[PDB]
Amino acid sequence: GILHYEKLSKIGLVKGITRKYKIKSNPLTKDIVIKMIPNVSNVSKCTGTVMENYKSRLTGILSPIKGAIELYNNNTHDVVMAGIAIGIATAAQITAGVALYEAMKNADNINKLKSSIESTNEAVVKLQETAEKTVYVLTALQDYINTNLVPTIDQISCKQTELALDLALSKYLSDLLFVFGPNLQDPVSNSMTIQAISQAFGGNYETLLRTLGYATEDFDDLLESDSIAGQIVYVDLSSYYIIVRVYFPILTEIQQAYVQELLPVSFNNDNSEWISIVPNFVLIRNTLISNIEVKYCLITKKSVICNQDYATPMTASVRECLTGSTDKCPRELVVSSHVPRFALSGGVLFANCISVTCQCQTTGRAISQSGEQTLLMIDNTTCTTVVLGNIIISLGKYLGSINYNSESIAVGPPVYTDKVDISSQISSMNQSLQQSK
Amino acid sequence: GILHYEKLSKIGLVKGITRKYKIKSNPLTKDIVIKMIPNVSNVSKCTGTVMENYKSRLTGILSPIKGAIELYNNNTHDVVMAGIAIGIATAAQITAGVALYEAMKNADNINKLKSSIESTNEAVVKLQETAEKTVYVLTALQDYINTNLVPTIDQISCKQTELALDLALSKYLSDLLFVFGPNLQDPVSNSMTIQAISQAFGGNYETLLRTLGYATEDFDDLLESDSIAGQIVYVDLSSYYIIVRVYFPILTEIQQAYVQELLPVSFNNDNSEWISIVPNFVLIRNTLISNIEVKYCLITKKSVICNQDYATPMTASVRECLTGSTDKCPRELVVSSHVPRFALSGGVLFANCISVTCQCQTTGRAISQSGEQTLLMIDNTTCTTVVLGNIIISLGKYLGSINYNSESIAVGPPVYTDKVDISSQISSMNQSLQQSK
Amino acid sequence: GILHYEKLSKIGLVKGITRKYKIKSNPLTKDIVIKMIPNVSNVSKCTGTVMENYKSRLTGILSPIKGAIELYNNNTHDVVMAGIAIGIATAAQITAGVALYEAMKNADNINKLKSSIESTNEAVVKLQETAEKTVYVLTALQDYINTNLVPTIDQISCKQTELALDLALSKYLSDLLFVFGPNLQDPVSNSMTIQAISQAFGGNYETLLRTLGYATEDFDDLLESDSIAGQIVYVDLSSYYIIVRVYFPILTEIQQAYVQELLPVSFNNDNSEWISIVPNFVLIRNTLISNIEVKYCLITKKSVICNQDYATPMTASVRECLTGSTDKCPRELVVSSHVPRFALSGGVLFANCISVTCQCQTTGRAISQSGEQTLLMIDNTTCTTVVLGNIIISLGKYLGSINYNSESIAVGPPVYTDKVDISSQISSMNQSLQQSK
Amino acid sequence: DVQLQESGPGLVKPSQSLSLTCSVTGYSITSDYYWNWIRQFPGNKLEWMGYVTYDGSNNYNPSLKNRISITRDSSKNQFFLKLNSVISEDTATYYCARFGSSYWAMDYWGQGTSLTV
Amino acid sequence: DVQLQESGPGLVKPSQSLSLTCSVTGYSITSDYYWNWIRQFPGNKLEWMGYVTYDGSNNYNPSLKNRISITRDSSKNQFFLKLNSVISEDTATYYCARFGSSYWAMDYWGQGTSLTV
Amino acid sequence: DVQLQESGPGLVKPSQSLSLTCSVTGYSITSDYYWNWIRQFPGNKLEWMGYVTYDGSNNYNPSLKNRISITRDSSKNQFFLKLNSVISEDTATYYCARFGSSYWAMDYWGQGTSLTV
């Protein structure tokens, strides 16, 4: 269609899976309370100085988070944000700041359960925010205490219980700091993944999300596409809990859009093996061809699921390559013994039969590629079942030109992609340029 | 000041947070012993062959570490290092080798506690190195055994205890290998982070560091800036413990130095949306402008904290861009729907009002950007409170030119940054060059 | 030898460690069963609805894996693969598909133990596949239940046991999803590391591999070089277990091949400090010089161990640099205070004595480097023991030219490697080119 | 405290375009939630038709995907169900409902507009 | 069910090249396993000599590394032990064996060819 | 085993520069530790003034940051407290002390130089 697939296959770019394009949007929110400190009432006789030291260390961790959150809460009034008081912010910080303000309308109800949050003695409990709303409290290490320390009070010495508690708390903080430590300069954000907030509950995000009652057909893709996120909207440094707003978006199918994967196959040119350097994921919207940074997206067999639009510009030469101008397609020399030397597409086999041994199962005859050919197309109009190494493939028919193997193409320029090679090429061209100029 | 902030804001580079620059230095050291093998005396009747297999596997892991350490200890004499015997080393390996030699002066005292280390049966114990010095022994899995296996000896069958111990030990090694396995070709190093050594104690670095008595205002920043490091200075393959020297540096404020963040904002040019390609973190020292690899540093709201100097060269054209020559500033075409289209700085709003809807809250009037304008500056001399989408911002006053919106600038060349696009651009320029030459 | 080491050392590229090159090959396989769901018979009275919800969630995770596996199993017949039915595949997917077919010959025997797999109540058990073959079943969370929940049935309330089980299962799934979730679009693969499959057994790969009876001299290098891999060959959604084929290859020493490390040392040129930009790992095979992507390989002091051939092309100019044409070697300006300013090789010290203080221990005399010199070579024909800062090095003798320090070289062009600088350099050269053309 | 009130013609001819309006009081149609349409056939069988979200995005029941459009009018705080063309089978009571995160269910329902075709 | 059967000359002269053949029935020499050679000296001391894998790769005992070559002939399903030159000490019973993942040991052994030098 | 011994003028005039010397025996001033100055006022209130580290880096008390310089002379194994200008309030007993990782505290203190301004 839009990509000139026949000429592209001739330079090792075999049409791969066509995937549809999705972006997360329109999220609904829920608030959950994470208690950052366990209830040690049932082990209290043997806690010693542990909880006192724990609370001090934890306050140091949570305090700068609370501060950054308050900065926005003290600047937004009713919903107008004090741009002067904020001074410097990105659009993302401002938007998150608005979401923060709105969230406080509910955080204020949750906070009236302060004493009911303090008293929770189970890993997960149900409190009433309002008669019509529930808020759950997830408590760090509460299960550890309830099943590992409480039953052991009269089995191990009292001092050993103290040490066991101290270590459980210290390990919790060591893991907690990666996310809730100094790295979190922007707690006023709605882009922070839920798997990163669940660290406050031991990394157990499945319990967190199940507790909230969320389960959808697209749920696992939303998780691994980093679309389910949360925002810390409130921090309590006396009771040691945080209120987290969790965003549950839906995936919007982008209309007239898809991501086309190309399967890179080495090919022959001038008695050497080459691989083409083009995007192996081309994003097409309407009739526009652009690049996509799929390294930030979840790729399934059916779709590319992104948490934002990751479309990027493409040069004119690459677009011209993709639409048929193979003289514009860069190639890198293959020096490695481990590259794709063939690919299957549409039931048709595209292979470099100079670098692999292509034998026909039906006749026992070799499939011979001439020096002038890049790849051979092997389909069942020539060989119904083909052997490549120890792999036997039953082939279909090619729906493109019957003369595919009889027509040569222009092949583009050699390039080198090593980061060092890029610097070398720039300075070399620059010296040639100075001679010319 | 040094950066021409007014012209830079006109191409989407809105002055962001000015941070001060810090580098870790002048570290004080302490030695701690990590026992790599638990004390199973209180479960010994049900250990079976587990500890024997554990010790063999563990020796295989620790042995090459001990060997590399001995290489330097056998070459340094008194402090002169045998350059001939070492043969090949970097300055870093040589420096670490000197630190290793010095460390042995204390490792030799710790080693006289060998039998007192072997006997430890608690996760953390205090031994006397000298009358005036304490050394702590941190024991892997000792808490697990003391609270999970010992209390269960008469509750579960003896064979189940054996299996539980075997699995605890095996999980420990599986996690341990990432750091203490073959990846550690250079144990003679003082750059290895403490969070990586704490793996020998289950990853519990908070307990390790608390045991050593360290707690400072800058402690959490030192941890996440990877400034607190340790060196393995001694390995005992019979008692299965290592002596780790832990470095505790202080942060030196670099004088006449700061890192200036720029907030990238898309802008209009020739009926299309563009983002500028400049460093978004510019390191300034004295009057020199250079690049900084902040990807290796901890960025807080107040400072950029690095474990070394990460300043790098900048081209003349980029420096000229940053000092006002906007015709030298590269731009990349925006094809994405998710880019910053505005930023707030100094209470002043910088926005691309062609790509967003800018409406004045005070009057209900639209804020119109002409084709000839890149960005509009919106401040309270035009609109006191402004609406961008669903965000309402109360604005301050711009302290630069009152005619900001009335004066156009030169806009630099288009570029493409995709890794494929870079290779394409190089070969395309090269063919044009050959025609010229 | 092949690299012109004497001229290279003069531009800061001091010969480092010569390592031999290895690639994993010829793997033998074993099948192991991982039970994805624990046996709760001994806690069954207090499981509530937990296992029912667990199984539903788990089926959602395993179902798409089973589907992708069946796609190939339904297309391969006897070993011919239905290329038409497959439609689109890479050579790697096709090869893995063949391995999958072969694996089913044994999976079919394992599956006859279905009821014996369901009944397993220990973390590791031994079942008979055939009279001459054993298959082990590794059960997730079985140890947790056997030692933490079963002994506590009459110590904690029944409801607390339910909650403890629910959390253990939920944490398991939260960790499991990273690998066995939507990211695994290609379960028909034999390149997936064993450390990634062991997640199905809590990440405990040491137990998995020990159970299989594998232990070799090269075992730890195979693990950290990502050479020990597995394939999911069968998924049972009723009994909740998977059959994993584990590949155990051997390391083949590549003949007439080695990887030469260069130790980058800053040097003086035109009153400034420079670092050379060349590959610091050069792969040499026969007489060919190429680049190696060691970032994907395990580097030990003796060898570079790769799970495939990672050789890549090198430009003519870089190869010319490496073979003696130092006018072709790119240099980047040093603006940082933390760069190697010296290196030790062959017992000979290579140092930039303009940027460091080089003092002779034997005489107390300073070692002076002139402006025309890049580096000084310090060996014992000039100074037997040398002091660089606080490091004292006893030196050997240089086996190259005695006039090393007396002969100057050509120094190549300046480059900038910052990603922004690359885009800037391209557009700047392009404008000069347009003036010329 | 949301009162969803739907209204429209109680009778349309075959091949005419149907337009039902759901007026919402007590909450802004643009600030949150998903705004759904459901219809109940004479046999009391309930069918979900689709929704428009707070930002304007749509999600429809595939069986009638090509005949349905759900839109909003923020100035009146209303949302609308439009069917490009109706068929005799489309005789049903049409309800509007609010879906949200509190229950992950449609909780507030209107009274229902009984439509004859 | 593999029967490894080795054969070759029971007598060779010093400085001649020795070639022993191991015929394998019951399994393909190319599809799996490592195919080993071991020899037992008159004092009953066993020495592992090396193997050829399923793909053709070799691994030899360093003590005789420069005199040994282990090859395959897939069309006959055979593998061969070749010694470039023999010395009086090479008098031994030569066994071929299969090594595999089931035991990580050489399980099926041939009967052994008794060679005199 | 470090003996910190401080010395200097017991009397300086206002507006003169004060220089106190701390001589250290038993350990090298350049190999380890932080070398501190502390002063005790007539009311026995202790004030930390600052330190110079083993590498020469400084850290001072902000209240007197612009009047203080702490330096070293490695050849004499000494470190010095210099005050650019003294004020009557600077009358105090000046102590030097060693800070290190053993205690994370200043353990070895000198006897103190009693200074009059």
Next chain:
Amino acid sequence: QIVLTQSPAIMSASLGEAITLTCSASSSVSYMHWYQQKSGTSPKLLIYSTSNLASGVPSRFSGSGSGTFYSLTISSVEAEDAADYYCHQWYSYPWTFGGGTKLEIKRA
């Protein structure tokens, strides 16, 4: 779509007795919601997320289930329970309802 079935279509119970209303899914869902429709009124949420009671719902109601099988339990059935109870899933699109079961109240 996911088809929800609720058989038998009509059930009856005496005053004061418990009755269990059931639902089966053609494909697994994680949660099931239940709605109660009384004559002359719109369906009103009864049970949400399988086991929870909606805002004005009497303590008589409860529920459970997983995967493809769910139930709505009415303890101590009373006259106000004479309604069509619908099984609803929102797990996959389109969101669907079962045909609904009518609970009749037995009277002499």
Next chain:
Amino acid sequence: QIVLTQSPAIMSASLGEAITLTCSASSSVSYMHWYQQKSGTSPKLLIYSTSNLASGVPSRFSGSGSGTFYSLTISSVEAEDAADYYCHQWYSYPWTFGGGTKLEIKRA
């Protein structure tokens, strides 16, 4: 800075009795050190890192605390304990001392 206060400034105890010397911080610290200054001598480290005894310190001394509240406990007070005890923090810069408390020994 972090201000350390130690009230009352002067305390007294009889021979053989326990006395607790206290310190409060304006901001939390993780550890507190204590120094003992006898007349005519420099302050000498008594307790370090909150609870540990320094090199030559008698077993009579001990300590504890966290955050903003710390204490130095002297058991079995004797004549040698007639000194100014200082509260010291090194957590944040500048390093600071409290005003110090003098312990008097009661005598007939």
Next chain:
Amino acid sequence: QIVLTQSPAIMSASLGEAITLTCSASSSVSYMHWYQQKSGTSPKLLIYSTSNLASGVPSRFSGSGSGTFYSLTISSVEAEDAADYYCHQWYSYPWTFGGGTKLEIKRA
């Protein structure tokens, strides 16, 4: 290489008694295999991966060990056990065997 030694070279046992055959390694291995060679026949795998019994091996045999010390235990020794038992490692290259120990059966 890794040298395997098995001393004494010759052992004897009575019918019905247990005998332990031993092996020591010059360097640690994780597993040890054992082979049994009867006169006129090739060595046949007896014990694999230290403790497991090979295909046709009698229940009389067992084994254990770690690191550098391993053993082969024969319980209830019988006439068929009159063989050369070899210690084998495959941990490092070259793969090696011990010299082998001969078990003699005592007879009146």
